Amino acid sequence: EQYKFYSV
Amino acid sequence: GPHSLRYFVTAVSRPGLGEPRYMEVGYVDDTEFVRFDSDAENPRYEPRARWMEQEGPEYWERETQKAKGNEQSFRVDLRTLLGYYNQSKGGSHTIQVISGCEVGSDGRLLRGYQQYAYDGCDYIALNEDLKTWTAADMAALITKHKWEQAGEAERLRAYLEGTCVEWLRRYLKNGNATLLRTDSPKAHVTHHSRPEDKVTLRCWALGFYPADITLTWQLNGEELIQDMELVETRPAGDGTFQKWASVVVPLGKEQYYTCHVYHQGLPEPLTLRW
Amino acid sequence: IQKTPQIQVYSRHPPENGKPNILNCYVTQFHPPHIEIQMLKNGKKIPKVEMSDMSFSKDWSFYILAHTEFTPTETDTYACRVKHDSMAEPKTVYWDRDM
Ligand SMILES: *[C@@H]1O[C@H](CO[C@@H]2O[C@@H](C)[C@@H](O)[C@@H](O)[C@@H]2O)[C@@H](O[C@@H]2O[C@H](CO)[C@@H](O)[C@H](O)[C@H]2NC(C)=O)[C@H](O)[C@H]1NC(C)=O
Ligand SMILES: *[C@@H]1O[C@H](CO)[C@@H](O)[C@H](O)[C@H]1NC(C)=O
């Protein structure tokens, strides 16, 4: 499963 | 041996042509197994290896929702970076992320990682300790500070040590017949004339898995690694790999050169001549 | 950071006329990501073509595979044509059966 990315 | 779960993420803006193209490709070792491409009709997370048929519909629904959320985040990232770097709104830019984990034969974590690139250069990366980030420039330092104040490394650490490891274990269990197999390389040597009384001997290795392999040319029992040309190990379209390595030798001395092939599927390395 | 693609063309198995095989066009070490790749049979675009194995190296350059099933005939010529910002004109690399 993939990671939940937030933001830079 | 050890195994790995890796995701390659890319967001590429296209000023004047709509929203950025967003793509996610997942791998277990050298086998592509999942993919999301915002450019398709009704983009959804899709299986890329047969054993992924073992996941239920909920897997695909949840991963699709995550990918869409991820797509929005990177779209926002692209905009944000334009500001950090003081760039125009009309150029195309790229954000890339490599994320994943590796476990030993016993399924325990060996290491986790996540590295970002902006326009093909290092931007920010998680340190091996899984507790701090390293910024490549002053823009990335803005991100580092935001992430530190938001407890982002702690969140990521939980994913790498938990979710990543557990799912990798599950994928290796479900796809054991594919992921834990060994396909032995089959070799052959080609010969091509050249000007100045020389010939090119090319050693080929085909149909092998995993991708890791070693090809060397020897003369006098000593490897020639230096004056030999080669291509990087490459996928062959069916889950296997191939590679070639060549050396230029004097016409009439070909029999003095031998190609050696070392691979997990070769109990004894292959030795070949032309 | 604009890198020109390496274009490699090869079949899964040593070629045998009339025997199903797989033709590959691996495009690597390129940047930016935008690129157009097409496989051709006797100069005409092959419709089947699957794109797979997209990845990037440690220096971030892009890699991707175009592949299709094919049954070569003695007179058929196959090639791969690539269009990338790093080049003026599209580059075509031919399949060399005896390489
Ligand atoms: C791969 O593993 C299977 C065992 O099944 C696996 O575990 C399940 C829970 C699920 O994750 C499946 O998708 C997996 O395939 C092996 O098949 C078993 O082999 C035993 C003997 O060792 C046999 O008695 C059982 O009947 C088999 N089980 C089933 C469900 O058919 C299989 O041999 C392994 N393949 C390779 C190449 O190692
Ligand atoms: C951003 O670039 C513009 C020119 O395009 C320049 O006038 C301005 O000083 C720059 N801003 C900063 C903070 O460097």
CSV table of C-alpha atoms and ligand atoms in Angstrom, one decimal:
chain,number,residue,atom,x,y,z
A,1,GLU,CA,0.0,0.0,0.0
A,2,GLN,CA,1.0,3.6,-0.8
A,3,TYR,CA,1.6,6.4,1.6
A,4,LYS,CA,-0.8,9.3,2.0
A,5,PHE,CA,1.2,12.3,0.9
A,6,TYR,CA,0.5,15.8,2.3
A,7,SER,CA,2.2,18.8,1.1
A,8,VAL,CA,5.5,20.6,0.8
B,1,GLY,CA,16.9,-12.9,0.7
B,2,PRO,CA,15.8,-9.4,1.4
B,3,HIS,CA,12.8,-7.9,-0.5
B,4,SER,CA,11.5,-4.4,-1.1
B,5,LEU,CA,8.4,-2.4,-1.7
B,6,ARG,CA,9.0,0.7,-3.7
B,7,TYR,CA,6.7,3.4,-5.2
B,8,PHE,CA,7.8,5.9,-7.9
B,9,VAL,CA,5.6,9.0,-7.9
B,10,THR,CA,5.7,11.8,-10.5
B,11,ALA,CA,3.7,15.0,-11.0
B,12,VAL,CA,4.4,17.0,-14.1
B,13,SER,CA,2.7,20.4,-14.7
B,14,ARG,CA,1.7,21.4,-18.3
B,15,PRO,CA,0.8,25.1,-18.4
B,16,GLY,CA,-2.0,25.8,-20.8
B,17,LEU,CA,-2.8,22.1,-21.2
B,18,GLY,CA,-4.9,21.4,-18.1
B,19,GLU,CA,-3.9,20.0,-14.7
B,20,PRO,CA,-0.6,18.2,-14.1
B,21,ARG,CA,-0.1,14.6,-15.2
B,22,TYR,CA,0.2,12.4,-12.0
B,23,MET,CA,1.5,8.9,-12.0
B,24,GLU,CA,2.2,6.3,-9.3
B,25,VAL,CA,4.0,2.9,-10.0
B,26,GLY,CA,4.6,0.4,-7.3
B,27,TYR,CA,7.1,-2.4,-7.3
B,28,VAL,CA,7.9,-5.5,-5.1
B,29,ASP,CA,11.6,-6.2,-6.0
B,30,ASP,CA,11.9,-5.9,-9.8
B,31,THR,CA,8.3,-6.7,-10.5
B,32,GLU,CA,5.8,-3.9,-11.3
B,33,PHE,CA,2.6,-4.6,-9.5
B,34,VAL,CA,0.3,-1.5,-9.2
B,35,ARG,CA,-0.1,1.7,-11.1
B,36,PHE,CA,-2.2,4.9,-11.2
B,37,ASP,CA,-2.1,7.4,-14.2
B,38,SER,CA,-4.3,10.5,-14.0
B,39,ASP,CA,-4.2,10.5,-17.8
B,40,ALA,CA,-6.5,7.5,-18.3
B,41,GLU,CA,-10.3,7.5,-18.8
B,42,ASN,CA,-11.7,7.3,-15.2
B,43,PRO,CA,-8.3,6.8,-13.6
B,44,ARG,CA,-8.2,4.1,-10.9
B,45,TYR,CA,-5.5,2.1,-9.1
B,46,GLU,CA,-4.8,-0.9,-11.3
B,47,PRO,CA,-3.2,-4.3,-10.8
B,48,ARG,CA,0.1,-4.8,-12.8
B,49,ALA,CA,0.9,-8.4,-11.7
B,50,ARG,CA,-1.5,-11.4,-11.8
B,51,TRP,CA,-1.3,-12.2,-8.1
B,52,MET,CA,-2.8,-8.8,-7.2
B,53,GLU,CA,-6.1,-10.4,-8.3
B,54,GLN,CA,-6.1,-11.8,-4.7
B,55,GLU,CA,-6.9,-8.3,-3.3
B,56,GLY,CA,-10.7,-7.6,-2.9
B,57,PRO,CA,-12.5,-4.7,-4.5
B,58,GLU,CA,-12.0,-2.6,-1.3
B,59,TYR,CA,-8.3,-2.7,-1.9
B,60,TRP,CA,-8.7,-1.0,-5.3
B,61,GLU,CA,-11.3,1.5,-4.0
B,62,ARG,CA,-9.2,2.6,-1.0
B,63,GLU,CA,-6.0,2.9,-3.1
B,64,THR,CA,-7.8,4.8,-5.8
B,65,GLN,CA,-9.1,7.3,-3.2
B,66,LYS,CA,-5.6,7.7,-1.8
B,67,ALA,CA,-4.0,8.2,-5.2
B,68,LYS,CA,-6.6,11.0,-6.0
B,69,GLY,CA,-5.8,12.6,-2.7
B,70,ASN,CA,-2.1,12.2,-3.5
B,71,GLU,CA,-2.6,13.7,-6.9
B,72,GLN,CA,-4.2,16.8,-5.4
B,73,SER,CA,-1.4,17.2,-2.9
B,74,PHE,CA,1.3,17.1,-5.6
B,75,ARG,CA,-0.7,19.5,-7.8
B,76,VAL,CA,-0.6,21.9,-4.8
B,77,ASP,CA,3.1,21.1,-4.4
B,78,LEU,CA,3.9,22.1,-7.9
B,79,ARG,CA,2.2,25.5,-7.3
B,80,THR,CA,4.0,25.9,-3.9
B,81,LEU,CA,7.4,25.2,-5.4
B,82,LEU,CA,6.9,27.8,-8.2
B,83,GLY,CA,6.7,30.3,-5.3
B,84,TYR,CA,9.6,28.9,-3.3
B,85,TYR,CA,11.8,29.1,-6.4
B,86,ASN,CA,10.3,32.4,-7.8
B,87,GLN,CA,9.4,30.8,-11.2
B,88,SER,CA,6.9,31.7,-13.9
B,89,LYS,CA,3.5,30.0,-14.2
B,90,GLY,CA,4.2,29.0,-17.8
B,91,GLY,CA,7.0,26.5,-17.6
B,92,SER,CA,6.6,22.8,-17.0
B,93,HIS,CA,8.1,21.4,-13.8
B,94,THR,CA,8.5,18.0,-12.3
B,95,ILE,CA,8.2,16.6,-8.8
B,96,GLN,CA,9.4,13.0,-8.2
B,97,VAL,CA,9.2,10.9,-5.1
B,98,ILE,CA,10.8,7.5,-4.3
B,99,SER,CA,9.2,5.8,-1.2
B,100,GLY,CA,9.4,2.4,0.3
B,101,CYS,CA,10.9,-0.2,2.6
B,102,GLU,CA,13.1,-3.2,2.6
B,103,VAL,CA,12.9,-6.3,4.8
B,104,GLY,CA,15.2,-9.3,5.4
B,105,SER,CA,14.4,-12.9,4.7
B,106,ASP,CA,12.7,-13.0,8.1
B,107,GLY,CA,10.4,-10.2,7.1
B,108,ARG,CA,11.8,-7.7,9.5
B,109,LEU,CA,12.6,-4.1,8.5
B,110,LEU,CA,16.1,-3.4,7.2
B,111,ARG,CA,15.3,0.1,6.1
B,112,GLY,CA,12.7,2.6,5.0
B,113,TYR,CA,13.1,5.7,2.8
B,114,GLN,CA,11.5,8.6,1.0
B,115,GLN,CA,13.3,11.1,-1.2
B,116,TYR,CA,11.8,14.0,-3.2
B,117,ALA,CA,13.3,15.7,-6.4
B,118,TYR,CA,12.2,18.9,-8.0
B,119,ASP,CA,13.1,19.4,-11.7
B,120,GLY,CA,15.4,16.4,-11.5
B,121,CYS,CA,17.5,17.5,-8.5
B,122,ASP,CA,17.5,16.5,-4.9
B,123,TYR,CA,14.9,18.5,-2.9
B,124,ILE,CA,14.3,16.8,0.5
B,125,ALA,CA,14.9,13.3,1.9
B,126,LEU,CA,14.2,11.4,5.1
B,127,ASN,CA,17.4,10.4,6.9
B,128,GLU,CA,18.1,6.7,7.7
B,129,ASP,CA,17.2,7.3,11.4
B,130,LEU,CA,13.6,7.9,10.1
B,131,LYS,CA,13.4,10.8,12.5
B,132,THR,CA,14.8,13.8,10.6
B,133,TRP,CA,14.9,15.2,7.0
B,134,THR,CA,17.8,16.6,5.0
B,135,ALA,CA,17.0,19.6,2.7
B,136,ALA,CA,19.1,20.1,-0.4
B,137,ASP,CA,18.6,23.9,-0.7
B,138,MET,CA,16.9,26.8,1.0
B,139,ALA,CA,13.5,26.1,-0.6
B,140,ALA,CA,13.6,22.6,0.9
B,141,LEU,CA,14.4,24.1,4.2
B,142,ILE,CA,11.0,25.8,4.2
B,143,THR,CA,9.4,22.3,3.7
B,144,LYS,CA,11.7,20.8,6.4
B,145,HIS,CA,10.5,23.4,9.0
B,146,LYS,CA,6.8,22.9,8.1
B,147,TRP,CA,7.2,19.1,8.4
B,148,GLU,CA,8.9,19.3,11.7
B,149,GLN,CA,6.2,21.5,13.2
B,150,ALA,CA,3.5,19.1,11.8
B,151,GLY,CA,5.1,15.9,13.1
B,152,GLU,CA,5.4,14.5,9.6
B,153,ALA,CA,8.5,12.3,10.2
B,154,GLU,CA,6.7,10.6,13.0
B,155,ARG,CA,3.8,9.9,10.6
B,156,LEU,CA,6.1,8.6,7.9
B,157,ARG,CA,8.0,6.5,10.4
B,158,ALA,CA,4.8,4.7,11.4
B,159,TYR,CA,4.0,4.0,7.7
B,160,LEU,CA,7.5,2.7,6.9
B,161,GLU,CA,7.8,0.5,10.1
B,162,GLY,CA,4.2,-0.6,10.0
B,163,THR,CA,2.0,-0.5,6.9
B,164,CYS,CA,4.9,-0.7,4.4
B,165,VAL,CA,6.4,-3.8,6.1
B,166,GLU,CA,3.1,-5.6,6.7
B,167,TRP,CA,1.8,-5.1,3.1
B,168,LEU,CA,5.2,-6.1,1.6
B,169,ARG,CA,4.9,-9.3,3.7
B,170,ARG,CA,1.4,-9.9,2.4
B,171,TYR,CA,2.4,-9.3,-1.3
B,172,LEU,CA,5.3,-11.7,-1.0
B,173,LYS,CA,3.0,-14.2,0.5
B,174,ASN,CA,0.3,-13.8,-2.2
B,175,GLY,CA,2.7,-13.6,-5.1
B,176,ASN,CA,5.3,-16.1,-3.8
B,177,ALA,CA,5.1,-18.1,-7.0
B,178,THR,CA,6.2,-15.0,-9.0
B,179,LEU,CA,8.2,-13.0,-6.5
B,180,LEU,CA,10.2,-15.9,-4.8
B,181,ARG,CA,11.1,-17.6,-8.1
B,182,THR,CA,14.5,-17.7,-9.8
B,183,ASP,CA,14.7,-17.8,-13.6
B,184,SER,CA,18.1,-18.8,-14.8
B,185,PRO,CA,20.0,-16.8,-17.4
B,186,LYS,CA,20.6,-18.4,-20.8
B,187,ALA,CA,23.7,-17.0,-22.5
B,188,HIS,CA,25.2,-16.7,-26.0
B,189,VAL,CA,28.0,-14.7,-27.7
B,190,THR,CA,27.8,-12.7,-30.9
B,191,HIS,CA,30.7,-11.6,-33.1
B,192,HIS,CA,31.0,-8.5,-35.3
B,193,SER,CA,33.9,-7.3,-37.5
B,194,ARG,CA,35.3,-3.9,-37.1
B,195,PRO,CA,37.9,-1.8,-38.9
B,196,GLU,CA,41.6,-2.1,-38.1
B,197,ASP,CA,41.6,-5.9,-37.7
B,198,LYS,CA,39.4,-5.9,-34.6
B,199,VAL,CA,36.2,-7.7,-33.6
B,200,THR,CA,33.5,-7.1,-31.1
B,201,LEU,CA,32.5,-10.0,-28.9
B,202,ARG,CA,29.1,-9.5,-27.3
B,203,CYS,CA,28.0,-11.6,-24.4
B,204,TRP,CA,24.2,-11.9,-23.9
B,205,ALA,CA,22.2,-13.1,-20.9
B,206,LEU,CA,18.5,-13.6,-21.4
B,207,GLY,CA,15.4,-14.7,-19.6
B,208,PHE,CA,16.5,-14.2,-16.0
B,209,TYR,CA,14.9,-13.1,-12.7
B,210,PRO,CA,15.7,-11.4,-10.4
B,211,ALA,CA,17.3,-8.5,-12.3
B,212,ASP,CA,20.6,-8.6,-10.3
B,213,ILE,CA,23.3,-10.2,-12.5
B,214,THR,CA,27.0,-10.0,-13.3
B,215,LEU,CA,28.6,-10.3,-16.7
B,216,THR,CA,32.3,-10.1,-17.1
B,217,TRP,CA,34.8,-10.8,-19.9
B,218,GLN,CA,38.1,-12.4,-19.0
B,219,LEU,CA,41.5,-12.7,-20.8
B,220,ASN,CA,44.4,-14.5,-19.1
B,221,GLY,CA,41.9,-15.4,-16.3
B,222,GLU,CA,41.7,-11.7,-15.5
B,223,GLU,CA,38.5,-9.6,-15.9
B,224,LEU,CA,38.7,-6.9,-18.6
B,225,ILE,CA,36.1,-4.7,-16.8
B,226,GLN,CA,37.2,-1.3,-18.0
B,227,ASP,CA,37.5,-1.5,-21.8
B,228,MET,CA,34.2,-3.3,-22.1
B,229,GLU,CA,30.9,-1.7,-23.1
B,230,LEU,CA,27.5,-2.8,-21.8
B,231,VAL,CA,23.8,-1.8,-21.3
B,232,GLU,CA,22.0,-1.6,-18.0
B,233,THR,CA,20.0,-4.7,-17.1
B,234,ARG,CA,16.7,-4.2,-18.8
B,235,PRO,CA,13.1,-5.6,-18.6
B,236,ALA,CA,12.0,-7.9,-21.4
B,237,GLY,CA,8.2,-7.5,-21.3
B,238,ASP,CA,7.3,-10.7,-19.5
B,239,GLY,CA,8.6,-10.2,-16.0
B,240,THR,CA,12.2,-11.3,-16.9
B,241,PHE,CA,15.4,-9.4,-17.7
B,242,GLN,CA,18.3,-9.3,-20.0
B,243,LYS,CA,21.7,-7.7,-20.5
B,244,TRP,CA,24.7,-7.7,-22.7
B,245,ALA,CA,28.4,-6.8,-22.2
B,246,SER,CA,31.0,-6.5,-25.0
B,247,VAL,CA,34.7,-6.2,-25.5
B,248,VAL,CA,36.7,-5.3,-28.6
B,249,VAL,CA,39.5,-7.8,-29.3
B,250,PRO,CA,42.1,-8.6,-32.0
B,251,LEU,CA,41.0,-10.7,-34.9
B,252,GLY,CA,42.4,-14.2,-34.5
B,253,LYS,CA,42.5,-13.9,-30.6
B,254,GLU,CA,38.8,-14.5,-30.0
B,255,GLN,CA,39.3,-17.9,-28.5
B,256,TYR,CA,41.3,-16.3,-25.7
B,257,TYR,CA,38.3,-14.4,-24.3
B,258,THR,CA,35.5,-15.9,-22.1
B,259,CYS,CA,32.4,-14.4,-20.8
B,260,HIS,CA,31.4,-15.2,-17.2
B,261,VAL,CA,27.8,-14.9,-15.9
B,262,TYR,CA,27.0,-14.9,-12.2
B,263,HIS,CA,23.4,-15.0,-11.1
B,264,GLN,CA,21.2,-16.3,-8.3
B,265,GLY,CA,19.9,-19.0,-10.8
B,266,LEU,CA,23.4,-20.3,-11.7
B,267,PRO,CA,24.7,-22.7,-9.0
B,268,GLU,CA,28.0,-22.4,-11.0
B,269,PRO,CA,28.7,-19.3,-13.1
B,270,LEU,CA,28.4,-19.7,-16.9
B,271,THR,CA,31.6,-19.5,-18.9
B,272,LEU,CA,31.3,-18.9,-22.6
B,273,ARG,CA,33.5,-18.4,-25.6
B,274,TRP,CA,32.8,-17.5,-29.3
C,1,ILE,CA,18.8,19.1,-16.2
C,2,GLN,CA,17.8,18.0,-19.8
C,3,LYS,CA,19.1,14.5,-20.5
C,4,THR,CA,18.8,12.8,-24.0
C,5,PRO,CA,17.2,9.4,-24.0
C,6,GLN,CA,19.0,6.1,-24.6
C,7,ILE,CA,16.8,4.0,-26.9
C,8,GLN,CA,17.3,0.2,-26.9
C,9,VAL,CA,15.4,-2.3,-29.1
C,10,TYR,CA,15.4,-6.0,-28.4
C,11,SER,CA,13.3,-9.2,-28.5
C,12,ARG,CA,12.5,-11.4,-25.5
C,13,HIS,CA,13.9,-14.5,-27.3
C,14,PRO,CA,16.5,-14.9,-30.0
C,15,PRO,CA,14.4,-14.3,-33.2
C,16,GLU,CA,12.9,-17.3,-35.1
C,17,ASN,CA,10.8,-16.5,-38.2
C,18,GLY,CA,7.2,-17.4,-37.6
C,19,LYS,CA,7.5,-17.8,-33.8
C,20,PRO,CA,5.6,-15.6,-31.4
C,21,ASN,CA,8.0,-13.4,-29.4
C,22,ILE,CA,8.0,-10.0,-27.6
C,23,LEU,CA,9.6,-6.8,-29.1
C,24,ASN,CA,10.9,-4.2,-26.6
C,25,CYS,CA,11.8,-0.6,-26.8
C,26,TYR,CA,13.4,0.6,-23.6
C,27,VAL,CA,13.9,4.4,-23.3
C,28,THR,CA,16.1,5.5,-20.5
C,29,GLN,CA,18.2,8.2,-18.8
C,30,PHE,CA,16.0,11.0,-20.0
C,31,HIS,CA,14.6,14.3,-18.5
C,32,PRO,CA,12.1,16.0,-18.6
C,33,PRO,CA,9.5,13.2,-18.4
C,34,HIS,CA,7.4,14.3,-21.4
C,35,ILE,CA,8.2,12.0,-24.3
C,36,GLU,CA,6.5,10.2,-27.2
C,37,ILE,CA,7.4,6.6,-28.0
C,38,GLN,CA,6.1,4.5,-30.8
C,39,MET,CA,7.0,1.0,-32.1
C,40,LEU,CA,6.8,0.5,-35.8
C,41,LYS,CA,6.4,-2.5,-38.1
C,42,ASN,CA,7.6,-1.8,-41.7
C,43,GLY,CA,7.2,1.9,-41.0
C,44,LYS,CA,3.6,1.8,-39.7
C,45,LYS,CA,2.8,2.4,-36.1
C,46,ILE,CA,2.0,-0.8,-34.1
C,47,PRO,CA,-1.3,-0.5,-32.3
C,48,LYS,CA,-0.8,-3.1,-29.5
C,49,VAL,CA,2.1,-1.4,-27.6
C,50,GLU,CA,2.0,-1.6,-23.8
C,51,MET,CA,3.9,0.8,-21.7
C,52,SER,CA,5.4,-0.6,-18.4
C,53,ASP,CA,8.3,-0.6,-16.0
C,54,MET,CA,8.3,3.2,-15.5
C,55,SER,CA,11.0,4.1,-12.9
C,56,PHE,CA,13.8,6.6,-12.2
C,57,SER,CA,17.4,6.1,-11.4
C,58,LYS,CA,19.2,7.6,-8.4
C,59,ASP,CA,20.1,10.7,-10.5
C,60,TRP,CA,16.3,11.0,-11.1
C,61,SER,CA,16.4,10.4,-14.9
C,62,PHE,CA,13.4,8.5,-16.3
C,63,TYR,CA,13.1,4.9,-17.6
C,64,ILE,CA,10.1,3.3,-19.3
C,65,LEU,CA,9.4,0.2,-21.4
C,66,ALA,CA,7.3,-0.1,-24.6
C,67,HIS,CA,6.6,-3.7,-25.6
C,68,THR,CA,4.4,-5.7,-27.9
C,69,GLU,CA,3.9,-9.3,-29.0
C,70,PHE,CA,5.1,-10.1,-32.4
C,71,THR,CA,5.8,-12.9,-34.8
C,72,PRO,CA,8.7,-11.9,-37.1
C,73,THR,CA,8.8,-12.8,-40.7
C,74,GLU,CA,12.0,-12.8,-42.7
C,75,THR,CA,11.2,-9.5,-44.5
C,76,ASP,CA,9.6,-7.4,-41.7
C,77,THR,CA,11.7,-4.6,-40.2
C,78,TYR,CA,10.7,-3.2,-36.7
C,79,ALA,CA,11.9,0.0,-35.1
C,80,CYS,CA,11.2,2.4,-32.3
C,81,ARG,CA,10.8,6.2,-32.8
C,82,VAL,CA,11.2,8.7,-30.0
C,83,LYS,CA,10.3,12.3,-29.7
C,84,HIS,CA,11.9,14.2,-26.8
C,85,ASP,CA,12.6,17.9,-26.1
C,86,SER,CA,16.3,17.1,-25.9
C,87,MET,CA,16.3,16.3,-29.6
C,88,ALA,CA,15.6,18.4,-32.8
C,89,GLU,CA,14.0,15.5,-34.7
C,90,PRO,CA,12.4,12.2,-33.5
C,91,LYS,CA,15.0,9.5,-33.2
C,92,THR,CA,14.3,6.0,-34.7
C,93,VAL,CA,16.3,3.0,-33.6
C,94,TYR,CA,15.9,-0.2,-35.6
C,95,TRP,CA,15.7,-3.8,-34.3
C,96,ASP,CA,19.0,-5.5,-35.1
C,97,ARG,CA,18.2,-9.3,-35.2
C,98,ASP,CA,21.9,-10.2,-35.2
C,99,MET,CA,23.2,-7.7,-32.6
D,1,LIG,C1,3.3,-20.5,-3.0
D,1,LIG,O1,2.5,-20.6,-1.8
D,1,LIG,C2,1.5,-21.6,-1.9
D,1,LIG,C3,0.7,-21.5,-0.6
D,1,LIG,O2,-0.5,-20.7,-0.8
D,1,LIG,C4,-0.2,-19.4,-0.5
D,1,LIG,O3,-0.8,-18.9,0.8
D,1,LIG,C5,-2.2,-18.6,0.7
D,1,LIG,C6,-2.6,-18.2,2.1
D,1,LIG,C7,-2.4,-17.5,-0.3
D,1,LIG,O4,-1.6,-16.3,0.0
D,1,LIG,C8,-2.0,-18.0,-1.7
D,1,LIG,O5,-2.1,-17.0,-2.6
D,1,LIG,C9,-0.5,-18.4,-1.6
D,1,LIG,O6,-0.3,-19.1,-2.9
D,1,LIG,C10,2.0,-23.0,-2.2
D,1,LIG,O7,0.9,-23.9,-2.4
D,1,LIG,C11,0.6,-24.7,-1.3
D,1,LIG,O8,1.6,-25.7,-1.2
D,1,LIG,C12,1.3,-26.7,-0.2
D,1,LIG,C13,2.6,-27.5,-0.1
D,1,LIG,O9,3.7,-26.7,0.4
D,1,LIG,C14,0.1,-27.5,-0.7
D,1,LIG,O10,-0.1,-28.6,0.2
D,1,LIG,C15,-1.1,-26.6,-0.7
D,1,LIG,O11,-2.2,-27.3,-1.2
D,1,LIG,C16,-0.8,-25.3,-1.5
D,1,LIG,N1,-1.8,-24.3,-1.1
D,1,LIG,C17,-2.7,-23.9,-1.9
D,1,LIG,C18,-3.7,-22.8,-1.4
D,1,LIG,O12,-2.8,-24.3,-3.1
D,1,LIG,C19,2.8,-23.0,-3.5
D,1,LIG,O13,3.5,-24.2,-3.6
D,1,LIG,C20,3.9,-21.9,-3.4
D,1,LIG,N2,4.5,-21.7,-4.8
D,1,LIG,C21,5.8,-21.7,-4.9
D,1,LIG,C22,6.4,-21.5,-6.3
D,1,LIG,O14,6.6,-21.6,-3.9
D,2,LIG,C1,11.7,37.0,-8.5
D,2,LIG,O1,12.1,37.3,-9.8
D,2,LIG,C2,11.7,38.6,-10.3
D,2,LIG,C3,12.0,38.7,-11.7
D,2,LIG,O2,11.3,37.7,-12.5
D,2,LIG,C4,12.5,39.7,-9.5
D,2,LIG,O3,12.1,41.0,-9.8
D,2,LIG,C5,12.4,39.4,-8.0
D,2,LIG,O4,13.3,40.2,-7.3
D,2,LIG,C6,12.5,38.0,-7.6
D,2,LIG,N1,12.1,37.8,-6.2
D,2,LIG,C7,12.9,37.4,-5.3
D,2,LIG,C8,12.4,37.3,-3.8
D,2,LIG,O5,14.1,37.1,-5.5
